[PDB]
Design a binder for this molecule. Structure first.
Ligand SMILES: CCCCCCSC[C@H](NC(=O)CC[C@H]([NH3+])C(=O)O)C(=O)NCC(=O)O
Ligand SMILES: N[C@@H](CCC(=O)N[C@@H](CS)C(=O)NCC(=O)O)C(=O)O
Lengths: 234, 223
């Protein structure tokens, strides 16, 4: 059944990405796969058709959510949770080339990158998701719930904004030059937010004017080829 | 600030904080805990924000590494196991196998982003929101139960494989206790606050938690 069929005709090389057209978390992985130069195909599951129920899938991700990545080169190794997939990809790239692209070979920087990465996947993403749920998909309207989560999303961007502003000032103590969260270079730490930054408007957040720094940062990332490519569907 | 050891910034009721205490004492690392009084706003003090930009606990200062600061319980555990392993050559609560590390990371991210937050939201609507709203409560309590189902199904599959090769301890990854299992511990003990009876609703999870709650380092940390 499309899914069962795929699992009977998998490739020996590359990666297969399970995602959704409205899954920022899914595009997050596509972005990273793109940036790292990994060849992949994407399967956009249809939950309404019950594809996530497909036992073959629940084997790839016991959670039955997207994204999930099968690393075909490593004996169809399976990885679920966008953050685990991210750490796996950069680790693999670094060990195959000696170049920590979007990562770092130094433990200290890695822990900072992980700090941000966990913060985005467990503090930014979930809060944005709850704001969308109550403002649009809940069985009834609860304004206090929508405000709670909407405020937290703002609070979180406050944190990022402040970190980007400081990284900026430091460079001044040597105006539109790219500034980043860790090691003054682009990392998965930065990339992990791009996808979500593009949907926060839907809960009333206007990055352009609410968070000057965040805006310039998300704009620098959004102009990246790999980022536009991934976002288009390549 | 010491030149050796670790300073753990937590809060007496933060399960994420004890998650760090547990891993820390389990790996034999020496540490002192600094319980923040959120009433005074010590988590928002500029002194503490320089450590955790998010202004929340847990936060950890690694004195041996020039007072390197780590925030986010997930990032902290990865740092501690990576550090313990680079020092001893023994992947305690971790793994030398990359495929297993990815799996350990999977569960870890799942717990920190799909378990702890949901449990936290159930608590909020059942006890702290400006108004009682059943649907909001049911939403998160159901999701917390859906998650325990995932864990349950995995421990059951793990026990099945064991039996081939019985209250023997089974684990999420590599048939050895890892930070993936310990991550759920602190929270496992509080789901009773939202109506989930682990013993009854999730048998395997129950045994799995007994084993962790019984461990020495765990007890020492849970104080
Ligand atoms: C921006 C839109 C609103 C929020 C949706 C988030 S993307 C799709 C969602 N996936 C996730 O939430 C993944 C979370 C997981 N913690 C990860 O980081 O991989 C899913 O599969 N769906 C859950 C389900 O179908 O039950
Ligand atoms: N870094 C942790 C954060 C855990 C967390 O949010 N802990 C709560 C304690 S229950 C906290 O700091 N609360 C302070 C507040 O809400 O102001 C994680 O996301 O894994």
């Amino acid at each position: 059944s499309r899914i069962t069929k795929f699992f009977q005709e998998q490739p020996l090389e590359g990666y297969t990405l399970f995602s959704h057209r409205s899954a920022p978390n899914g595009f997050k992985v596509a972005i990273v796969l793109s940036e790292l130069g990994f060849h992949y195909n994407t399967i956009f599951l249809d939950f309404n058709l019950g594809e996530h129920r497909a036992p073959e899938f629940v084997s790839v991700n016991p959670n039955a959510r997207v994204p999930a990545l099968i690393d075909h080169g490593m004996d169809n190794l399976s990885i679920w949770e966008s953050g685990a997939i991210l750490l796996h990809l950069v680790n693999k790239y670094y060990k195959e080339t000696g170049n920590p692209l979007l990562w770092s070979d130094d433990l200290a920087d890695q822990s900072q990158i992980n700090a941000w990465l966990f913060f985005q996947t467990s503090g930014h993403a979930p809060m944005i998701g709850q704001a969308l749920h109550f403002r649009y998909f809940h069985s009834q309207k609860i304004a206090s719930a929508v405000e709670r989560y909407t405020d937290e999303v703002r609070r979180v961007y406050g944190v990022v904004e402040m970190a980007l502003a400081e990284r900026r000032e430091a460079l001044v103590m040597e105006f539109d030059y790219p500034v980043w969260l860790v090691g003054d270079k682009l990392t998965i730490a930065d990339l992990a937010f791009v996808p979500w930054n593009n949907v926060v408007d839907r809960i009333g957040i206007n990055i352009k004017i609410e968070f000057p720094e965040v805006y310039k940062w998300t704009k620098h990332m959004m102009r990246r080829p790999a980022v536009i490519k991934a976002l288009r569907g390549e």
